[PDB]
Amino acid sequence: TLTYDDIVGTGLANKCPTLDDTARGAYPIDSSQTYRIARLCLQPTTFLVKEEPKNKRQEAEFVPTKLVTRETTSLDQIQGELKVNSDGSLTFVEEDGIDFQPVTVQMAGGERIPLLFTVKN
Amino acid sequence: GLPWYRVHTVLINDPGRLIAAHLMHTALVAGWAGSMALYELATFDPSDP
Ligand code: CLA
Ligand code: CLA
Ligand code: CLA
Ligand code: CLA
């Protein structure tokens, strides 16, 4: 129900679709039905950079980082056949879609650590 | 002919100019604090406590 001229600017197009609390109602998978996924979206919030542990060998760490490039982070519009193989488990094989958003978070120190948030292939 | 150590004596009386003096050795110190403070800060490494 929302137009681009209605959603542009909110920095909403980077946050993706919710499902209201009428959930927990399982989807009836067949095994007699082909089934595919439509725009699988991964909106993120927590980026943690495993701290290059100092020479000492006691539990390496996973520090929290500050986001830099505003909102250029989330990824969606991912589609792919959703396989229903033996033992009734579902396997989703992505064929294409926007999934390689390049983000750069600022580490504990002043480090600028850039990764390529992606769920490709 | 007033020798240098005697030159800072100038004031002694005239607390006015003197206030501005302490008013300085004070604005000169404070500075040095923030100063090297920045400095040390420009070099302290946190990487490992
Ligand atoms: C209410 C009475 C009162 C108060 C609170 C003070 C306070 C002070 N006097 Mg002082 N003084 C007083 C009466 C007072 N005096 C009287 C009656 C005489 C003789 C008649 C003097 C003669 C005297 C001498 C010779 C000196 C002082 C100095 C000082 C300062 C020493 C510490 C300082 O450098 O910190 C640093 C201060 C701050 C970081 C902030 C304080 C300044 C703000 C709070 C005041 C507001 C700015 C503006 C309105 C000017 C205020 C002037 C007024 C507060 C004195 C300190 C601010 C020393 C000094 O500071 O000289 C520069 C100094 O050498 N006084
Ligand atoms: C404990 C607090 C304290 C005290 C009591 C003093 C007292 C003094 N300071 Mg001072 N100062 C301080 C903290 C203090 N300062 C801090 C934190 C800074 C920031 C760096 C300064 C920066 C400063 C400057 C730029 C000057 C002073 C000066 C002075 C003197 C004013 C008149 C005079 O020199 O008397 C008599 C003072 C002496 C005869 C000098 C004694 C100092 C000796 C111990 C040092 C010997 C040489 C030096 C350590 C190494 C040489 C370096 C090279 C350039 C030759 C006075 C003795 C003025 C001064 O001429 O010398 C003090 C002056 O120009 N101060
Ligand atoms: C009011 C605001 C303010 C605040 C919050 C600070 C805070 C600080 N200053 Mg600082 N500073 C100030 C104003 C201030 N300063 C001003 C106005 C000047 C110049 C006029 C300075 C000049 C200065 C220097 C040169 C240095 C600092 C430093 C510091 C840091 C350590 C100092 C400390 O912990 O001493 C702890 C101990 C005391 C505060 C007291 C020690 C002195 C006592 C023992 C004198 C006794 C008084 C006498 C006995 C009175 C009679 C007692 C009677 C009541 C019984 C700290 C962050 C140090 C630092 O590393 O920062 C970069 C440092 O080297 N400052
Ligand atoms: C504590 C603060 C303090 C203050 C406000 C004063 C103030 C004064 N002292 Mg003095 N004095 C002090 C501490 C202080 N003194 C101490 C601790 C000592 C023994 C260590 C002396 C020994 C002394 C002597 C023998 C004489 C004075 C004299 C004086 C008066 C004029 C001298 C002058 O300014 O030379 C001018 C200062 C210079 C031209 C600076 C050059 C000297 C050195 C090379 C400078 C080095 C300091 C600078 C490079 C950086 C400072 C760093 C700081 C940490 C010291 C003046 C009222 C004179 C006086 O009034 O007659 C009795 C005098 O003859 N003082």
Nearest ligand for residue B11 CA: 4
Interchain contact A70–B (C-beta under 8 A): no
Q: Report helix, strand or coil for A36.
A: strand
Show the tokens assigned to B3. Answer: 């020798």
Q: How far is CA A28 from the centre of its chain?
A: 25
Q: The tokens 């989330």 sit on which residue?
A: A74
Instruction: Using DSSP bridges, classify how beta strands A48-51 and A61-64 pair: parallel, antiparallel or unpaired.
Output: antiparallel
- For every residue of A38-98, which 3-state class applies, written as one string? EEEEECCCCCEEEECCCCCCCCCEEEECEECCCCCCCEEEEEEEEEEECCCEEEECCCECC
Interchain contact A109–B (C-beta under 8 A): yes
Side chain identity, residue A75: L
- Indicate the DSSP class of residue A117: E
B3-13 in b/e burial notation, b at 16+ Cβ within 10 A? eeeeeeeeeee
